[PDB]
Amino acid sequence: RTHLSLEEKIKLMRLVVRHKHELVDRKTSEFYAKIARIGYEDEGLAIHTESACRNQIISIMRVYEQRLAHRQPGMKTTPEEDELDQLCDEWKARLSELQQYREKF
């Protein structure tokens, strides 16, 4: 139930995207455990359980969708916002890929 800083959210999403091809459909536990471990060991995140790590990512993505939906033409963005948006877009695409695979075949 902790709150990540923007910096920590970017560090976490960098890891999620770097390791995105390691997520196996219906084996989420192993993936979010690994992300929590590497985030702690390398990026100085606090110790998170698997569930707490997964919830942080769910929350980042939920806020991302809000930001996307409320984006206005001509708005100013920061480089950190741009990076997080790009990382979230890439993670969303991975999740959608796995969904499509499960549904279609």
Residue numbers in the entry: 29 to 133
From the paper:
However, it has also been shown to bind Ter1 sites at the rDNA repeats where it stalls replication fork progression. Here we present the crystal structure of the Sap1 DNA binding domain which allows us to model Sap1 bound to DNA in its proposed replication fork stalling orientation based on structural homology searches and biochemical data. The overall structure of the Sap1 DNA binding domain (DBD) reveals a bundle of four helices, with helices α1-α3 making up a single myb-type helix-turn-helix (HTH) domain. In our crystal structure we have identified a dimerization interface between Sap1 monomers that we predict to be engaged in the direct repeat binding mode.
Since molecular replacement was not an option due to lack of sequence homologs, we attempted to solve the structure by anomalous diffraction using selenomethionine labeling. Unexpectedly however, the structure solution was greatly facilitated by anomalous scattering originating from an arsenic adduct (dimethylarsinoyl) to Cys81, formed due to the cacodylate buffer used in the crystallization solution used in the PACT screen (25% w/v PEG 1500, 0.1 M PCTP pH 7.0 (propionic acid, cacodylate and bis-tris propane)). For comparison we also collected native data from crystals grown in 25% w/v PEG 1500 and 0.1 M SPG buffer pH 7.0 (succinic acid, sodium phosphate monobasic monohydrate, glycine). The two resulting structures were virtually identical, showing that the arsenic adduct did not induce structural changes in Sap1. The packing between the α1, α2 and α3 helix bundle is imperfect and forms a deep cavity. Cys81 is one of the residues lining this cavity and the arsenic adduct previously described occupies the cavity without disturbing the fold of the Sap1 DBD. The structure was solved using a serendipitous arsenic adduct (dimethylarsenate) that bound to residue Cys81. This adduct did not alter the structure and shows that there is a cavity inside the Sap1 protein that can accommodate an organic molecule. The cavity’s connection to the solvent is too narrow in our structure to let pass a water molecule. However, the fact that cacodylic acid, which reacts normally with solvent-accessible cysteines, is found inside the cavity indicates that the pocket may be accessible from the solvent at least temporarily. We speculate that the cavity in Sap1 might play a role in a similar mechanism in S. pombe.
